Design a protein around this ligand. Structure first.
Ligand code: ZN
Ligand code: ZN
Length: 263
């Protein structure tokens, strides 16, 4: 039987959540998080479902952000495997969303599970901010404005978009907090770099620009933001896939980031 990482990633992949459809992916995540003490707030905007979940009431607020939607399969004649059927071949998990970004979502859930099991008494708070419209040419903005307008301000945020080139964690992208005009302690990037170095024994390359508008918005509003996720060589393409070993590594990097920040 699978690791909980692969088991959950497979589950997510099976749900045909073509933008902006969620197809029940968020309910899967919400069930896992409800079991860990998270309060959940579902929020629909336009044709999209979103949610915000939080565990803890104390500073800092650390958040995992991402989307459940995926882009269309493209030509089925080109697909070696059924696009919405998670298909394991030679150590790789094939399917729409494997890399962008249902793999990372499963890694976020199991990392928080493992962390909350080792550190039930963690500092700070853990949040999830999940949307289903990211591949569009709205949801993030609407959720973030809701949190701001009730003075619930994310301190630090990992966006699990697939940031990597050859191997998971070889690149991460760093947001500029408030566009580079708010003070920035570097506490998040230090934590993530620390985690990536433990796992890979190599520092990631850094980009300071170029991520998603979604993450750029979170940073502009005041969060420290880092994008860290799987290899992106196959995103939005036929025969999208992810190295399963890299999903185990990413889960560890997320758990280790949590240790450094909260544990
Ligand atoms: Zn994405
Ligand atoms: Zn995408």
């Amino acid at each position: 039987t699978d690791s909980p990482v692969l088991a959950l990633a497979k589950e997510l992949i099976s749900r045909q959540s073509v933008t902006p459809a969620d197809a029940g992916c968020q309910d899967l995540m919400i069930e896992r998080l409800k079991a860990l003490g998270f309060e959940i707030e579902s929020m629909v905007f336009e044709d999209t479902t979103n949610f915000w979940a939080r565990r803890g009431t104390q500073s800092p607020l650390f958040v995992f952000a991402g989307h459940t939607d995926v882009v269309p399969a493209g030509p089925l004649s080109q697909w070696h495997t059924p696009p919405f059927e998670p298909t394991v071949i030679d150590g790789f998990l094939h399917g729409r969303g494997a890399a962008d970004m249902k793999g990372s979502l499963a890694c976020m859930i199991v990392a928080v599970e493992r962390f909350i099991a080792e550190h039930p008494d963690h500092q700070g708070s853990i949040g999830f901010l999940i949307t289903s419209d990211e591949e569009g040419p709205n949801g993030t903005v609407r959720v973030v404005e809701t949190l701001m307008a009730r003075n619930e301000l994310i301190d630090m945020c990992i966006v699990g978009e697939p940031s990597s080139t050859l191997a998971v964690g070889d690149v991460v992208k760093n947001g500029r907090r408030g566009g580079g005009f708010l003070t920035d302690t570097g506490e998040l990037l230090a934590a993530v770099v620390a985690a990536v170095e433990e796992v890979n024994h190599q520092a990631p390359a850094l980009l300071t620009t170029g991520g998603t508008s979604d993450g750029r918005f979170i940073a502009q509003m005041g969060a420290q933001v880092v994008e860290l996720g799987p290899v992106n060589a196959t995103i939005h393409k036929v025969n999208e896939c992810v190295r399963i070993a890299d999903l185990e590594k990413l889960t560890d990097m997320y758990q280790k980031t949590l240790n450094h920040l909260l544990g």
